[PDB]
């Protein structure tokens, strides 16, 4: 909405490009560290998302090994980086926090 | 009886034939290689492993077949 909020968004696009997982065809959520909440969120994913996730990780490990990167056109565009794990992971933490509120009284 | 019938029904593929397009098979290069179609949704795995064999005419197809018999075949319904 704002000139400086377009600048936070352009600095975020800068960082995204500097992080460079997109160069390996990865999405942001592919790159997350696997904790207990995370493991459960992966577990809770539908078939199509899990299978795509597996392939994207597979592809990037293959590139990592051969020390290559994808052609520029095949990089994950910041605008279309689908945050597929978000609602799943938010729900797992929601559930944990409740259990923890219950374990308090 | 058979030769009579072949002249009776198959004659009429002569007049003039072949000449312009003579198609003989070129040999096929065998490659030591692997194809792996991972599918964990299928209950049992299927594996086919093979080396290059010599072909129809070769006299030592007989000896290979004897060794293939020694190894043989199995199935879970076999009594043995």
């Amino acid at each position: 909405v704002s000139a400086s909020s377009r600048w936070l968004e352009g600095i975020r696009k800068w960082y995204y490009n500097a992080a460079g997982f997109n160069k390996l065809g990865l999405m942001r959520d592919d790159t997350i560290h696997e904790n207990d909440d995370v493991k459960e969120a992966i577990r809770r994913l539908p078939e199509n998302l899990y299978d795509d996730r597996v392939f994207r990780i597979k592809r990037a490990l293959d590139l990592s090994m051969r020390q290559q990167i994808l052609p520029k056109e095949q990089w994950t565009k910041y605008e279309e980086d689908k945050s597929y794990l978000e609602p799943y992971l938010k729900e797992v933490i929601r559930e944990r926090k409740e259990r923890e509120e219950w374990a308090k009284k | 009886q058979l030769l009579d019938l072949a002249q009776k029904h198959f004659s009429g593929l002569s007049g003039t034939y072949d000449e312009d397009a003579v198609p003989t098979l070129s040999p096929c290069r065998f490659t030591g290689s692997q194809i792996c179609h991972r599918e964990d949704g299928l209950p049992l795995a299927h594996v086919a492993i093979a080396v290059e064999g010599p072909g129809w005419a070769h006299p030592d197809n007989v000896a290979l077949q004897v060794a293939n018999a020694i190894i043989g075949h199995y199935d879970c319904t076999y009594g043995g």
Partner: protein
């Protein structure tokens, strides 16, 4: 202070001449075995 001087320079040449033969050779051994992975091709075929 260093009586071994002459001997260490001698075996040192032998060390360098051996490594110059062995380094590319062990590299080629590793590169041979690893070519199975380096040239491997992936295809993803999800259902309809």
């Amino acid at each position: 202070a260093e009586p071994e001087h002459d001997h260490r320079k001698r075996m040192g040449l032998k060390m360098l001449l051996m490594m110059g033969l062995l380094l590319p050779l062990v590299y080629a051994m590793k590169r041979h075995k690893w070519s199975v992975l380096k040239s491997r091709k992936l295809a993803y075929r999800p259902p309809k």
